[PDB]
GROMACS .gro file of C-alpha atoms in nm:
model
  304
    1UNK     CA    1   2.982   5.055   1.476
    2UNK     CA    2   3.083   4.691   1.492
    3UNK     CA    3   3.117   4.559   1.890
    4UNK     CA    4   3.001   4.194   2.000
    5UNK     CA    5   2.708   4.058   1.860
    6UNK     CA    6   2.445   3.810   2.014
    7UNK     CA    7   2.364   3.493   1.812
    8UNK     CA    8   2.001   3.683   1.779
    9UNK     CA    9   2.131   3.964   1.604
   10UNK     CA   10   2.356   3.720   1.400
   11UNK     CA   11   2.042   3.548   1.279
   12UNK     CA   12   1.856   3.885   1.231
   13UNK     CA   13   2.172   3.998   1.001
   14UNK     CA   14   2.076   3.746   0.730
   15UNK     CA   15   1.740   3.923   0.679
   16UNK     CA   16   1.577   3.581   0.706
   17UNK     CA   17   1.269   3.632   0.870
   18UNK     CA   18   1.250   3.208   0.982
   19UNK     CA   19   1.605   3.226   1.123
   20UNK     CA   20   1.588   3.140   1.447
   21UNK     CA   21   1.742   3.069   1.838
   22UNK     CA   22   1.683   2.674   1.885
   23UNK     CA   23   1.608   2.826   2.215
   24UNK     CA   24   1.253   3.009   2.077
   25UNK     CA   25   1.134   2.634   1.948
   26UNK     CA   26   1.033   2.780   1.623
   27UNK     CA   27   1.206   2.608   1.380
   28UNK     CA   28   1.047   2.471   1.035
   29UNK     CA   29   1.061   2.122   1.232
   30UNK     CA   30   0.946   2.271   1.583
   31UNK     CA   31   0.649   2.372   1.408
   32UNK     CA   32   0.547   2.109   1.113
   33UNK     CA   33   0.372   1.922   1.373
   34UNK     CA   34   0.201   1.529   1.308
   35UNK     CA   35  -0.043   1.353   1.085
   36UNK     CA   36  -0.236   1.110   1.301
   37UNK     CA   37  -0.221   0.817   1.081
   38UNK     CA   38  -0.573   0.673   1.286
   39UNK     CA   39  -0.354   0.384   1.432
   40UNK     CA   40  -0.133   0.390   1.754
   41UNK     CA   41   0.076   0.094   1.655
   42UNK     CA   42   0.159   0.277   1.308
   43UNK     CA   43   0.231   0.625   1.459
   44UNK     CA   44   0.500   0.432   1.682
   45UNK     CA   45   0.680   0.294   1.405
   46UNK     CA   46   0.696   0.632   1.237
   47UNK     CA   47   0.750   0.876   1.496
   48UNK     CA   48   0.838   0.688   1.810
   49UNK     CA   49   0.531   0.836   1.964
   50UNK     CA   50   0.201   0.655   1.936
   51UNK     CA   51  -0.002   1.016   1.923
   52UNK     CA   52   0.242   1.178   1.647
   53UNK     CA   53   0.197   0.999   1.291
   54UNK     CA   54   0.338   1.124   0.995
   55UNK     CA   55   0.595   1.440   0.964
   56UNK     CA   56   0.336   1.724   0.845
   57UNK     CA   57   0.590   1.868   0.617
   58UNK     CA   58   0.754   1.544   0.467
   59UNK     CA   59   0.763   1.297   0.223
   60UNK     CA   60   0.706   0.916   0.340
   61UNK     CA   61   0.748   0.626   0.076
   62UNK     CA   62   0.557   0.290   0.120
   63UNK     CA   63   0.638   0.024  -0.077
   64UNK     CA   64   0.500  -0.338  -0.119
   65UNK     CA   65   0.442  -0.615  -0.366
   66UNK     CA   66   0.145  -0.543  -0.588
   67UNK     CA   67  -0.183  -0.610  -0.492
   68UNK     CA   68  -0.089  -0.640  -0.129
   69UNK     CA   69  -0.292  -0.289  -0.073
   70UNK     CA   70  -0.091  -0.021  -0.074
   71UNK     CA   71  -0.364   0.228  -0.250
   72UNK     CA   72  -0.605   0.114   0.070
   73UNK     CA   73  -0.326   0.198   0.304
   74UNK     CA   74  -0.304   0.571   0.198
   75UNK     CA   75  -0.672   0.625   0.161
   76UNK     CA   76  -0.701   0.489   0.524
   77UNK     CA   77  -0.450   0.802   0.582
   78UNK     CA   78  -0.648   0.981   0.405
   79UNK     CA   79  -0.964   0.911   0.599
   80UNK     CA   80  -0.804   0.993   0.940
   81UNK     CA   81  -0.706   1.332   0.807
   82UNK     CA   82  -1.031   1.451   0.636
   83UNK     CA   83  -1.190   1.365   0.975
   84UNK     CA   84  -0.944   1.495   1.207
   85UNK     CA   85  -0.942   1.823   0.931
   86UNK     CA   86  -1.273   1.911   0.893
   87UNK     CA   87  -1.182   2.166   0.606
   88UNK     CA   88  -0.890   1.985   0.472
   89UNK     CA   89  -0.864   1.833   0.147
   90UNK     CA   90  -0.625   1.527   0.006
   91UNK     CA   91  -0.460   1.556  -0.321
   92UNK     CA   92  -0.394   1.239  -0.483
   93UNK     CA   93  -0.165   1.186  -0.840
   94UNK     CA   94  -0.265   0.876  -0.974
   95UNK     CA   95  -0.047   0.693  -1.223
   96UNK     CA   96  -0.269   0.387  -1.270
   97UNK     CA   97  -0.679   0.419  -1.308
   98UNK     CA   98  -0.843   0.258  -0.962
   99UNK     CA   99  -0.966   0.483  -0.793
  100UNK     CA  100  -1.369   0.582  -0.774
  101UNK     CA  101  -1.633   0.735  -0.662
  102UNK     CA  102  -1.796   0.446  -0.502
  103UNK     CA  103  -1.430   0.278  -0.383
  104UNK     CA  104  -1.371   0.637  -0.126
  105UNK     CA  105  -1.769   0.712  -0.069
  106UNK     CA  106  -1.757   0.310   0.094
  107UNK     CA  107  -1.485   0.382   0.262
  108UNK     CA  108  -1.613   0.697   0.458
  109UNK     CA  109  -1.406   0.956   0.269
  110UNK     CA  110  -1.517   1.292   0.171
  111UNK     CA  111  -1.551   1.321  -0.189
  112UNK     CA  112  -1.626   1.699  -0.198
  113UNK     CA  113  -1.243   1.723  -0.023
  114UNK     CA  114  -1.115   1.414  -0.255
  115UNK     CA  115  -0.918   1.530  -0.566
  116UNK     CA  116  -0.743   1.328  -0.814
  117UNK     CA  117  -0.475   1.444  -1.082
  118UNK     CA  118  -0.434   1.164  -1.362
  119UNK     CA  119  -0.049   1.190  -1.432
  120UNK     CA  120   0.146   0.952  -1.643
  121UNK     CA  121   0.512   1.088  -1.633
  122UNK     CA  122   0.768   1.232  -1.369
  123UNK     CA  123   0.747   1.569  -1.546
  124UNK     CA  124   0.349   1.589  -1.550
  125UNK     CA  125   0.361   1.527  -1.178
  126UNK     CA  126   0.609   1.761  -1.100
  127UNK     CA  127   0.461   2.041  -1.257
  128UNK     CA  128   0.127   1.965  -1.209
  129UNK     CA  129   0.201   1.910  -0.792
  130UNK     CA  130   0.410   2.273  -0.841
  131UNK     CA  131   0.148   2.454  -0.991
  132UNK     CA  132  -0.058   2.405  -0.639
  133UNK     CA  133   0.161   2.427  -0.415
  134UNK     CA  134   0.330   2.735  -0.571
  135UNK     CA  135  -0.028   2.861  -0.540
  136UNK     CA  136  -0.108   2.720  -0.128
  137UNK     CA  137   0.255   2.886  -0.091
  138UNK     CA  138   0.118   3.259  -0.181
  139UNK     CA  139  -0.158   3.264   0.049
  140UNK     CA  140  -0.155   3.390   0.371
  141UNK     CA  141  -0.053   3.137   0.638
  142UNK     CA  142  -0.417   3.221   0.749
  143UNK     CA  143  -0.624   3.171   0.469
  144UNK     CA  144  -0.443   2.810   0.406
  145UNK     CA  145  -0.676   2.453   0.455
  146UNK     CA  146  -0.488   2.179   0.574
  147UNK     CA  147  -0.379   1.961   0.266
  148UNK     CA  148  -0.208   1.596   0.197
  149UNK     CA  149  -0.092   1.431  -0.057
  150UNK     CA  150  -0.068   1.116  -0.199
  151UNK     CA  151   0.145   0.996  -0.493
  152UNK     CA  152  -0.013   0.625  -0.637
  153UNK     CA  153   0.227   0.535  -0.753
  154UNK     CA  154   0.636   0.675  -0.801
  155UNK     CA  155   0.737   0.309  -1.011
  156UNK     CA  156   0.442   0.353  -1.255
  157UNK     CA  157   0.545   0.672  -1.337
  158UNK     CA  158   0.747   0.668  -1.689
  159UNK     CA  159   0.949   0.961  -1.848
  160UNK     CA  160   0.840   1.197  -2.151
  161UNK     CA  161   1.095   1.039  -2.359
  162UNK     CA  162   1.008   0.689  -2.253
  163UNK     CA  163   0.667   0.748  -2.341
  164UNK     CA  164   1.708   0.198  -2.069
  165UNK     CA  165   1.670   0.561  -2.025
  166UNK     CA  166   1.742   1.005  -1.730
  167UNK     CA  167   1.463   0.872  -1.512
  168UNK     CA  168   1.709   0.837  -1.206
  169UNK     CA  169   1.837   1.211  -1.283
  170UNK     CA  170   1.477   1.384  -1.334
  171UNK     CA  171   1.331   1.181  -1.040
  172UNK     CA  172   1.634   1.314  -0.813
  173UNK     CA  173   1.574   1.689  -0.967
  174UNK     CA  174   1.165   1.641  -0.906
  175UNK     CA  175   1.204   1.517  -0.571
  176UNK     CA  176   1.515   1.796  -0.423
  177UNK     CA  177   1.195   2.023  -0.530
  178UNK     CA  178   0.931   1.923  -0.433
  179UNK     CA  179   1.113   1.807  -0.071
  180UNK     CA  180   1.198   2.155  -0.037
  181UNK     CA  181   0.837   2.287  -0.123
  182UNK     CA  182   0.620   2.063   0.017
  183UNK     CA  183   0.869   2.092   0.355
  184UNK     CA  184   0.805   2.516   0.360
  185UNK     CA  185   0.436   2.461   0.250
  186UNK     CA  186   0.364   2.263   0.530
  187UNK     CA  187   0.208   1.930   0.324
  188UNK     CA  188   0.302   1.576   0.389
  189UNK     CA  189   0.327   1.329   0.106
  190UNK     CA  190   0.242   0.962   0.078
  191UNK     CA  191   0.419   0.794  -0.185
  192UNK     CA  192   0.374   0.461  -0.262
  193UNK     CA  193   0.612   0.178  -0.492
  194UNK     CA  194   0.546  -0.141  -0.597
  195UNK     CA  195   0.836  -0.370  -0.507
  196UNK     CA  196   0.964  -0.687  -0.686
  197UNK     CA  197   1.379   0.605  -0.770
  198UNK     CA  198   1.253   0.539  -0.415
  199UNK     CA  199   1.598   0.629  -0.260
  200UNK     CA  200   1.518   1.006  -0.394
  201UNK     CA  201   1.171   1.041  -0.258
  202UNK     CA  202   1.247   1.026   0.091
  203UNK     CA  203   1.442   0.927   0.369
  204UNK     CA  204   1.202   0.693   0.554
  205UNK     CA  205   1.092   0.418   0.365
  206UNK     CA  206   0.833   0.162   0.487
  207UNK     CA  207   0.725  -0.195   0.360
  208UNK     CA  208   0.412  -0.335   0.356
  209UNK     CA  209   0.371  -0.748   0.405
  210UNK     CA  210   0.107  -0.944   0.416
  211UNK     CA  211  -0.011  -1.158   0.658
  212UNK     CA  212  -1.286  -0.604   0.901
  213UNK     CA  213  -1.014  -0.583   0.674
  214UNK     CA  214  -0.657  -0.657   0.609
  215UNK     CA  215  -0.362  -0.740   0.809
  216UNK     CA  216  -0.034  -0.615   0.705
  217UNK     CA  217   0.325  -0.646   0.881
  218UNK     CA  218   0.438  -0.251   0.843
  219UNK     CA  219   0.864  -0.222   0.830
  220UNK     CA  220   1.052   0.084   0.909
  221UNK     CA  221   1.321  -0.087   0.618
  222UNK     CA  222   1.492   0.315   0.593
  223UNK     CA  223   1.404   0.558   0.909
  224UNK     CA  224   1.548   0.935   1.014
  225UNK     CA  225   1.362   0.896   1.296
  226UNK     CA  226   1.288   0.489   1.370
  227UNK     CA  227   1.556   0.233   1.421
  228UNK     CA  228   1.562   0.030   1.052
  229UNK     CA  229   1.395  -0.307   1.052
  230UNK     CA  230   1.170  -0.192   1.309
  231UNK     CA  231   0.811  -0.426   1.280
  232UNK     CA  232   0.408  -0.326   1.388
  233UNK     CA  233   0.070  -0.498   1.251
  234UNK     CA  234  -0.155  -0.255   1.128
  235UNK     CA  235  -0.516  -0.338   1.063
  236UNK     CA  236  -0.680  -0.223   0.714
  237UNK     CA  237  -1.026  -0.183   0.752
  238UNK     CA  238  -1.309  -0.260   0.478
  239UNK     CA  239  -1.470   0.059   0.604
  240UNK     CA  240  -1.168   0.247   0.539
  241UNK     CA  241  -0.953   0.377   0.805
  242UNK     CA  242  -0.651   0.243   0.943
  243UNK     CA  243  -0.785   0.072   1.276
  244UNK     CA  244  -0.689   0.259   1.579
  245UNK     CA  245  -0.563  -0.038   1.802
  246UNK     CA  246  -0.500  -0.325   1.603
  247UNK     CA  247  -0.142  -0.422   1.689
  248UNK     CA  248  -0.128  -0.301   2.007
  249UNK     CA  249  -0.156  -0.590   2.210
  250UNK     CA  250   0.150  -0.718   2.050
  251UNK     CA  251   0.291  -0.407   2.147
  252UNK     CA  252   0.133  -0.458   2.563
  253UNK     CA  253   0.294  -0.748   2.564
  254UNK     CA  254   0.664  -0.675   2.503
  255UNK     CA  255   0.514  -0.368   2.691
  256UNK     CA  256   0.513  -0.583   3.017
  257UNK     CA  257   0.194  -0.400   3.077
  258UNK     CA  258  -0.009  -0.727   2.963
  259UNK     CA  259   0.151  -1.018   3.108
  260UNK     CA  260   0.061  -1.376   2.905
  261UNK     CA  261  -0.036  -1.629   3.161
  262UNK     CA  262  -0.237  -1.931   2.966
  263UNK     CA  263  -0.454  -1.895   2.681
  264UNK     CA  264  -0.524  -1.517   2.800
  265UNK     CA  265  -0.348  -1.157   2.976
  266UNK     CA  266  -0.325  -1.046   3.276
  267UNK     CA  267  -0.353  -0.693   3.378
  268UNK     CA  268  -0.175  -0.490   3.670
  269UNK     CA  269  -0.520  -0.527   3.924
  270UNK     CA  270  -0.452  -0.903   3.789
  271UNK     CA  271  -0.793  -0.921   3.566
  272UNK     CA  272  -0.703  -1.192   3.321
  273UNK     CA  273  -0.897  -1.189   2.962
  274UNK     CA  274  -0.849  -1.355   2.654
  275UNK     CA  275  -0.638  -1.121   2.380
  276UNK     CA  276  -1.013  -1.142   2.123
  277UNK     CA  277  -1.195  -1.030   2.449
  278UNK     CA  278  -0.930  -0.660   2.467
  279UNK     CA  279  -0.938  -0.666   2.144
  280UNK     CA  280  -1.359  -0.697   2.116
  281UNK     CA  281  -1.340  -0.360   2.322
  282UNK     CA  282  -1.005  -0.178   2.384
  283UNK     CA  283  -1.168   0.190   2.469
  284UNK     CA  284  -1.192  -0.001   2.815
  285UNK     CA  285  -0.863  -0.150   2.866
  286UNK     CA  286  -0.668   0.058   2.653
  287UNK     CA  287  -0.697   0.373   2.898
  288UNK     CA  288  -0.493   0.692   2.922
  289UNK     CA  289  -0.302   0.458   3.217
  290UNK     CA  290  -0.196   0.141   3.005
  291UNK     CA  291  -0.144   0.394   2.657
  292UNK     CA  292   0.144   0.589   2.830
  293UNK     CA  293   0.306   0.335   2.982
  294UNK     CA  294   0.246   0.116   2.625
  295UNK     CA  295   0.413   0.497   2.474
  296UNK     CA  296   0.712   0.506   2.728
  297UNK     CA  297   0.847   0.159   2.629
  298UNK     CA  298   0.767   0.221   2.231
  299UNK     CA  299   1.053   0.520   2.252
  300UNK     CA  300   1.249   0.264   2.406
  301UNK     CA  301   1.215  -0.008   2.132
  302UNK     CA  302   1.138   0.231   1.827
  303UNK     CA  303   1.420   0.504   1.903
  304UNK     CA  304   1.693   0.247   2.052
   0.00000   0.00000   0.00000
């Protein structure tokens, strides 16, 4: 009965139905796919790739001081997925009291596919982000809306005994979990942390710094997939989103695709135009031309 066996019926042996051949490209990573974040110059530092964005089955921590915006960073996530997901909905766990009606309806978000879970303690989020996705997890791959969600925020949550103590051992327990369920599910999570239990949350870790909206210096300060230290500019727009090329110019330059001669760029044709003049319109010089090549030097910089 038992001759020489293929690595197909090897796989087939453990009854797994997901096992697979690398070959067949159908592995749980082959197929969790991207969140556009809505920028170009963000998606690079995350996934080397300005048109990828955020792992769609992963866990992504942002940190910052307080007050520098955080909260507005993942709703402009948020926005760029409830447009780009016309029936998807964002799930956010909210550990402090900001967010409103009138805060996501100014900011273009959906608040018909906004929901928000009040949680005070690492066991109320756990089970209370179980209890759906144990639930999205039953349903047929093909009844299931896209979903994301958003923890605000892991260092405000305390303990059910707090409420020094345990927290380090039931945020390490939460997170193995939920890492493992939101990663079959297929849901990404934002997590942000005010900085002055990350290290269980997730692998890549990114700092905000500051310095239409809000510029922040982004920092890939613990990447799987970006080299550490790593540095964009992302633009926070008062209308919501994440802005689409804001930091990209800085990005053209080091590029070589935008040469600096004087108090402007030149182009390949040799065009030269002062950076607010791109910037006042880059639909026209940011074409499918200029983006690639832009792309081809950000795996360069952002992978090595």
């Amino acid at each position: 009965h038992h001759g020489s066996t293929s690595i197909t019926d090897f796989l087939r042996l453990t009854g797994n139905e997901f096992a697979s051949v690398a070959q067949d490209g159908v592995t749980a990573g082959d197929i969790s796919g991207w969140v556009d974040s809505g920028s170009y110059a963000f998606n690079a530092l995350l996934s080397g790739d300005i048109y990828k964005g955020f792992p769609g089955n992963k866990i992504v921590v942002i940190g910052a001081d307080p007050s520098t915006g955080k909260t507005f960073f993942a709703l402009g996530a948020a926005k760029n997925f409830l447009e780009q997901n016309k029936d998807g909905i964002v799930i956010c766990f909210e550990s402090e009291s900001a967010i409103t009606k009138n805060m996501l309806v100014e900011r273009g978000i959906d608040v018909k596919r906004f929901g928000v879970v009040p949680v005070s303690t690492v066991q109320q989020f756990k089970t209370q982000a179980l209890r759906i996705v144990d639930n999205y997890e039953k349903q047929p791959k093909n009844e299931r809306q896209p979903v994301l969600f958003i923890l605000d925020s892991l260092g405000m949550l305390s303990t059910d005994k707090e409420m020094r103590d345990t927290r380090a051992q039931l945020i390490k327990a939460a997170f193995r979990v939920l890492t493992l369920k939101l990663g079959r599910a297929g849901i990404p999570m934002i997590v942000t942390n005010h900085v002055y239990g990350a290290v269980y949350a997730s692998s890549t870790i990114l700092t905000l710094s500051k310095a239409t909206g809000v510029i922040v210096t982004v920092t890939a300060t613990k990447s799987r997939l970006t080299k550490e230290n790593s540095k964009i500019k992302c633009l926070i727009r008062y209308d919501g989103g994440l802005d689409r090329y804001y930091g990209m110019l800085e990005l053209a330059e080091e590029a070589g695709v935008f040469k600096k001669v004087s108090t402007r760029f030149e182009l390949e044709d040799g065009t030269k135009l002062f950076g607010k003049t791109i910037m006042e319109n880059p639909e026209k010089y940011f074409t499918n031309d200029i983006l690639e090549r832009i792309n081809d030097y950000v795996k360069r910089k952002f992978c090595y």
